Coordinates of C-alpha atoms in Angstrom, one line a residue:
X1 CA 113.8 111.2 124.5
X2 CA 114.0 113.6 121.5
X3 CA 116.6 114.0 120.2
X4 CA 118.4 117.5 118.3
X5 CA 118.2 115.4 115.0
X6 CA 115.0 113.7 115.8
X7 CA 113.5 117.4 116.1
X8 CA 114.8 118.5 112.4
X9 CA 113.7 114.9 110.8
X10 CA 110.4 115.4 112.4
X11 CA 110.6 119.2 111.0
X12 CA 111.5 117.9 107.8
X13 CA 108.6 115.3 107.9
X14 CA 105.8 118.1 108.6
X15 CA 106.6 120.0 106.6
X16 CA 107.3 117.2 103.4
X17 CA 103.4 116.1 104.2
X18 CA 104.3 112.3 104.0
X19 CA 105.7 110.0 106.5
X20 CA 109.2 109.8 107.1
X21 CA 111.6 106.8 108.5
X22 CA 115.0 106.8 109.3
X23 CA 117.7 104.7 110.6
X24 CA 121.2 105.5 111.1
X25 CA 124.2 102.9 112.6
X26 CA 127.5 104.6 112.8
X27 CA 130.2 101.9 113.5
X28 CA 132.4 104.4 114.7
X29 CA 130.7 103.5 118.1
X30 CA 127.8 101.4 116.9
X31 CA 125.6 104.1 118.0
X32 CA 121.8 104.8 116.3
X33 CA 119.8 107.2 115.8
X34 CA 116.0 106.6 114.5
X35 CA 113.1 108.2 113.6
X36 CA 109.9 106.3 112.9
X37 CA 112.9 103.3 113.7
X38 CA 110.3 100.7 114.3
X39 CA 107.3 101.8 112.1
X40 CA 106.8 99.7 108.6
X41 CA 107.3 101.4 105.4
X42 CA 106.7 99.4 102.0
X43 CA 110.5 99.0 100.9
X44 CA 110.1 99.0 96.9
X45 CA 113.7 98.4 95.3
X46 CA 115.6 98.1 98.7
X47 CA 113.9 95.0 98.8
X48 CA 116.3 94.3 95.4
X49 CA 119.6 93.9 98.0
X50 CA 117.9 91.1 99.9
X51 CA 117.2 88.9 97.1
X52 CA 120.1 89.7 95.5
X53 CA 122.1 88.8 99.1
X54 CA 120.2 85.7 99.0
X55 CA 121.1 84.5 95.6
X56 CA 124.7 85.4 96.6
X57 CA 124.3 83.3 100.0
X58 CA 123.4 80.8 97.7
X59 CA 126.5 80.7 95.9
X60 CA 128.7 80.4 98.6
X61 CA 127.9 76.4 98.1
X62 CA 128.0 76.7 94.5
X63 CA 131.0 77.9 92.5
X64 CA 129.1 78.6 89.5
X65 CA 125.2 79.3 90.1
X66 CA 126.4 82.9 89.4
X67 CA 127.2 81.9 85.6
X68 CA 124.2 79.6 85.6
X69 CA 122.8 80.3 82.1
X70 CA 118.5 81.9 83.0
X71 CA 116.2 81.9 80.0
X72 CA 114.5 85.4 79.2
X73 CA 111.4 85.3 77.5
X74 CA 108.8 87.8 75.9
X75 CA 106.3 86.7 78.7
X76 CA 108.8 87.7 81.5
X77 CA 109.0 91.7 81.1
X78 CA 107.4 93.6 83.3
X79 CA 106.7 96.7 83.7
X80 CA 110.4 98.5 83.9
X81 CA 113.2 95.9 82.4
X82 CA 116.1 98.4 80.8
X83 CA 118.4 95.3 80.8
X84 CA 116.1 92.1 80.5
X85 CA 114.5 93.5 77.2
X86 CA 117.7 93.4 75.7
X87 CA 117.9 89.8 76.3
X88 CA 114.8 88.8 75.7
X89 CA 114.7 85.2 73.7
X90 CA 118.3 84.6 75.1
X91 CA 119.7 83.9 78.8
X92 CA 121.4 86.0 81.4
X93 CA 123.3 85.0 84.4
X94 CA 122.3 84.9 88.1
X95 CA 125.1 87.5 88.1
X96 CA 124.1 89.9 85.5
X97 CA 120.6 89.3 86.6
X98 CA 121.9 90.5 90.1
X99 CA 123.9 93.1 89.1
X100 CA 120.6 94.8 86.8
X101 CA 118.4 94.5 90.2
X102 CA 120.3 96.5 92.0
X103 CA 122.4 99.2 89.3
X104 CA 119.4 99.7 87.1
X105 CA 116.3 98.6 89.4
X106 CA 115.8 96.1 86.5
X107 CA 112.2 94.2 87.8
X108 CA 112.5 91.3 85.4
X109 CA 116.0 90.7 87.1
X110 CA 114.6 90.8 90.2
X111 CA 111.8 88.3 89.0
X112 CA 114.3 85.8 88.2
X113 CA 116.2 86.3 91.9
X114 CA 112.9 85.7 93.5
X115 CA 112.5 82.8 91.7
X116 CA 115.9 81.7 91.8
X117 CA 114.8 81.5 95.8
X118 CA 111.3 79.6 95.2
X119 CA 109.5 83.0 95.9
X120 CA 109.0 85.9 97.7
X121 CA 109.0 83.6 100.9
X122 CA 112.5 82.8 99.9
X123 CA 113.9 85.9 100.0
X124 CA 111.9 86.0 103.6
X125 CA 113.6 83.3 104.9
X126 CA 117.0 83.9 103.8
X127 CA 116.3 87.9 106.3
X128 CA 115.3 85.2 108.8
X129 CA 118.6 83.0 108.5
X130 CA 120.7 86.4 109.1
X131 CA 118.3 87.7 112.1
X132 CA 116.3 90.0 110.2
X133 CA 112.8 89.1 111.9
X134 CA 110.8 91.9 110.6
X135 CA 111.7 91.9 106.9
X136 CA 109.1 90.1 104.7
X137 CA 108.8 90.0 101.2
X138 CA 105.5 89.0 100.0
X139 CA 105.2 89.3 96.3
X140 CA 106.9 89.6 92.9
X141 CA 107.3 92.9 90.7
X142 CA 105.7 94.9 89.7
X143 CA 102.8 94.6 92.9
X144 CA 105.3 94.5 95.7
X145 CA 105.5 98.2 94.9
X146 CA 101.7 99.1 95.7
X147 CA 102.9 100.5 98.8
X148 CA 99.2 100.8 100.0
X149 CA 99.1 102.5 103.6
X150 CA 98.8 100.2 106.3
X151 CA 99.7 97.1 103.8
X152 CA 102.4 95.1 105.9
X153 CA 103.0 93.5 102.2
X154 CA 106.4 93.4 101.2
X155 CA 107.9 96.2 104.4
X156 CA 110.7 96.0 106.8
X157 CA 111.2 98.3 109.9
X158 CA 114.2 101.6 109.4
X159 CA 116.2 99.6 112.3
X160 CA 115.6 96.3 110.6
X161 CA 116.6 97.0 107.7
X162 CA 119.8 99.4 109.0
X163 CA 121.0 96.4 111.1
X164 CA 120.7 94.1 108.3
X165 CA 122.3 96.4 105.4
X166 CA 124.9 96.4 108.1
X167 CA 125.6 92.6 108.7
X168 CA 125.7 92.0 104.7
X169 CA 128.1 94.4 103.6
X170 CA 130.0 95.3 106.5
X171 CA 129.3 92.3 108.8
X172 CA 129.6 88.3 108.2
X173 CA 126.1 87.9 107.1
X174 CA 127.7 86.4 103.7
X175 CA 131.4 84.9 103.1
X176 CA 134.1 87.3 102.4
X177 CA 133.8 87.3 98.4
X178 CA 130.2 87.5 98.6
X179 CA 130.4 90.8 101.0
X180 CA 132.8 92.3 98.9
X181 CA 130.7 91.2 95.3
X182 CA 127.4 92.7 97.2
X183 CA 129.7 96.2 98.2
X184 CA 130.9 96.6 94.6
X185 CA 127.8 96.1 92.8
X186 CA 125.9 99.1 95.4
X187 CA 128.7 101.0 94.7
X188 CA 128.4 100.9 91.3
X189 CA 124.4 102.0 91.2
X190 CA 123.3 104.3 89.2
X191 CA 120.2 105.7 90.5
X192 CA 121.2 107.0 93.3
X193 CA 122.8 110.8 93.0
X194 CA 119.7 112.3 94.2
X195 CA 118.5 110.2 97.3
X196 CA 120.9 110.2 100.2
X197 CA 124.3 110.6 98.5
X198 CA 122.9 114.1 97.1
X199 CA 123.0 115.2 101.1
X200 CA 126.3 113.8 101.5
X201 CA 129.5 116.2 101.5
X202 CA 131.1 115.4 98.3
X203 CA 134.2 114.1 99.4
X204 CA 132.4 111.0 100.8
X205 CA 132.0 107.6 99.0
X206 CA 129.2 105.4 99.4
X207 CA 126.8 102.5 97.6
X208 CA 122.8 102.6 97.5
X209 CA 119.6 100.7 97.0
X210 CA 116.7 103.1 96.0
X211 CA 113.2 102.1 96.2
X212 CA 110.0 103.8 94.1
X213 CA 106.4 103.4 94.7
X214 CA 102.9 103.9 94.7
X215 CA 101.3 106.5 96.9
X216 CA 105.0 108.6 96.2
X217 CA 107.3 106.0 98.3
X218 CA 110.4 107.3 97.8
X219 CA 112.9 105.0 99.4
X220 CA 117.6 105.0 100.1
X221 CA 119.4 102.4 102.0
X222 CA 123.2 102.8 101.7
X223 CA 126.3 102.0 102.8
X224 CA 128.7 105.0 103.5
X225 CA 132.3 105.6 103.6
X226 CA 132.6 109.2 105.3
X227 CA 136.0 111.4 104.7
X228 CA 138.0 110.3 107.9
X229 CA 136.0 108.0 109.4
X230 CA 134.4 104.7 110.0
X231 CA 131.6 103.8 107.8
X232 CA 128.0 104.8 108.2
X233 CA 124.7 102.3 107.3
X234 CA 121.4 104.5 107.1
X235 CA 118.3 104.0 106.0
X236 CA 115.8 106.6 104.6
X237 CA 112.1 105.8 103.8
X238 CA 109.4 107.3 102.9
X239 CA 106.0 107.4 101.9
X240 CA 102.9 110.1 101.1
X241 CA 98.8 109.4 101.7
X242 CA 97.4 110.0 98.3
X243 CA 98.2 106.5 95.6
X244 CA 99.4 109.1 92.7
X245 CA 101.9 111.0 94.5
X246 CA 105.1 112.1 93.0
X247 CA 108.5 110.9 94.0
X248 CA 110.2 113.3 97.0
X249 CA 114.2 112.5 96.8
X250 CA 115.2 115.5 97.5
X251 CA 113.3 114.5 101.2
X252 CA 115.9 111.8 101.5
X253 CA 118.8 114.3 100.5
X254 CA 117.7 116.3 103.5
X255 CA 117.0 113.6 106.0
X256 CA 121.2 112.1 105.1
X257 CA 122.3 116.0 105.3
X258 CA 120.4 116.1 109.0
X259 CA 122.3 112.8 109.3
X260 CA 125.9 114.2 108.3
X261 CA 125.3 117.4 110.1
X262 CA 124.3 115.9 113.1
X263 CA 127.7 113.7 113.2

């Protein structure tokens, strides 16, 4: 029950000295391959597509809550805001807001999101609503990236996640627009070159969530459009024992190469 890949991601996984969990759904058949597929891992930033799914879900009943004016205050920063700062005393919309959680990993943005849904049990509910029974987002940023081993805080499953990254930008987890709105704005991120796209052939397109933590939780979810053939959903997690780790992408470059390799 183990498979060729399996072997090098478990290789991969010794040898990187952390934990490592992948999911990968190929709709060319709808096939999956998994390692650590139904172990939690804290998910950081990935959690930023939920929320922001959630807000678009949202929208879908309301023309305009995406150019609903949102008041930015001094008090609101957090801890990494590139975009918020620069509208601090002023308003953004649920749209830009959206767009900074997920391109720049803006945590003020996501703030507003999460409150734009009543709270992290918001953005838990709306996973619930599209079948996602293992996602669970439990608190605000910055501490929903403590990523403390064994924490269930704020972590989602490699399959869980896969199957839902799947039903929101490929699937009918949100109206048409909204799908298409959601596919742009991952496509457009720009922290990503490192994590799973850097294991990619180059000739491949594809859109990305990353996620950074304590205890050196470096985290991908993307969407991928391989040369030639029908698009790829895979999920790469990981996290390391010791709370000051440093980041590992170039783990999660190797885990997508495995991936590609192993098509």
């Amino acid at each position: 029950q183990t498979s060729a890949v399996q072997q090098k991601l478990a290789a991969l996984e010794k040898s990187s000295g952390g934990r490592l969990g992948v999911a990968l759904i190929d709709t060319a058949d709808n096939t999956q391959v998994l390692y650590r597929g139904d172990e939690r891992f804290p998910m950081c930033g990935t959690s930023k597509v939920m929320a922001a799914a959630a807000v678009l879900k949202q929208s879908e009943t309301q023309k305009q809550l995406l150019n609903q004016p949102v008041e930015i205050k001094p008090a609101d920063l957090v801890n990494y805001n590139p975009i918020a700062e620069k509208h601090v005393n002023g308003t953004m919309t649920l749209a830009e807001l959206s767009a900074a959680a997920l391109q720049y990993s803006d945590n003020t943005a996501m703030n507003k999101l999460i409150a734009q849904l009543g709270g992290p049990g918001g953005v838990t509910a709306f996973a619930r609503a599209i079948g996602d029974e293992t996602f669970r987002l439990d608190r605000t940023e910055p501490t929903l990236n403590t990523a403390i081993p064994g924490d269930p805080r704020d972590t989602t499953t490699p399959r869980a996640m896969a199957q839902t990254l799947r039903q929101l930008t490929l699937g009918h987890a949100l109206g048409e627009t909204q799908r298409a709105q959601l596919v742009t704005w991952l496509k457009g991120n720009t922290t990503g070159a490192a994590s799973i796209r850097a294991g990619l052939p180059t000739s491949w397109t594809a859109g990305d969530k990353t996620g950074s933590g304590d205890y050196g939780t470096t985290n991908d979810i993307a969407v991928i459009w391989p040369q030639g053939r029908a698009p790829l959903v895979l999920v790469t997690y990981f996290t390391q024992p010791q709370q000051n780790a440093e980041s590992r992408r170039d783990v999660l470059a190797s885990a997508a190469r495995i991936i590609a390799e192993g098509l």
